[PDB]
Each structure stands twice: as C-alpha cells, then as structure tokens.
Amino acid sequence: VTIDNIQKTVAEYYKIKVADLLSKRRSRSVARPRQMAMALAKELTNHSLPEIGDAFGGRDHTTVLHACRKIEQLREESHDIKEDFSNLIRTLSS
DNA sequence: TGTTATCCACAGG
DNA sequence: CCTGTGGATAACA
C-alpha cells in the first residue's frame, strides 16, 4: 500500500480533494479525513512517522503520532469512524 | 468560551 | 534515524 494511494482513496471516500489532505486547514471536515489518512499510512505501510509527516504537507512527525492516537480513540467512541476505518482498509488492501 | 491539530525542543533506543 | 514526552499556541467546534 502506498501513501499516495491512501491519500487518493481517503479523499474520494470523504468527497474532498487530495490537496485538502496536504493543506494546513484544520477544519474538522478535512482534518478528520487527514488524520484518518495519516493513521492508515502508519497501520498499512512501513513508513516512519517522519516520512508520513513529510508526505502530508510537510507535517511534523509528532502530528502524525497525534493523528494515530486520536483515530484510535475515535474508533472506540464512534461507530461511524470505526466503520470508515474498516471500509477504507477493505478498499486499500484489495 | 473550551478544545485540539500543529509545531518545537528534547531525548534515549 | 526512530518513536515518544512536555509544552505552546493558533485554529478550531
């Protein structure tokens, strides 16, 4: 699984643009999908936190680490996030 | 308002 | 390098 693939898939899935994933915009409508894309990058690939960060608009590796934890948390608190996680992995590992 | 996604300064594996 | 921690803060909800 490649990061570029994850970004395109996630963008389409949430009906937003790949550029939104790279953008510094923090609005939840795009930051959530972004965090989901970053967490997937970490769970689906062997890329380090710094490499995933660079891959998402030059973000710090700690931001990716935060993303992973936030998505972990949300997966436990929201059935919809839990579903998006499953749906996306289903697609990406096809 | 209160919350948080992001970056920075560090640090031992 | 890598993964983590502690802290600030500008953006968010």
Distance A94 CA to B2 C1' (A): 42
Closest nt by CA–C1' to A53: B6
As a rounded value in angstroms, the CA-to-C1' distance for A17 and C3 is 30
Give the burial string for A28-65 (b: 16+ CB within 10 Å, else e). Answer: eebbbbbbbbbbbbbebbebebeebbbbbeebeeebbb
Per residue, the 3-state secondary structure of chain A, as one string, reads CCHHHHHHHHHHHCCCCHHHHHCCCCCHHHHHHHHHHHHHHHHHCCCCHHHHHHHCCCCCHHHHHHHHHHHHHHHHHCHHHHHHHHHHHHHHCC
Strand B within 7 A of A67 CB? yes
Contact in structure between A68 and A36 (CB atoms under 8 Å) = no
Ramachandran angles phi, psi of A71, nearest 5°: -65, -40
Method: X-ray
Answer whether any strand B atom is within 7 A of the Cβ of A34. Answer: yes
Domain covering A1-94 assigned CATH 2.60.40.10 in the classification: no
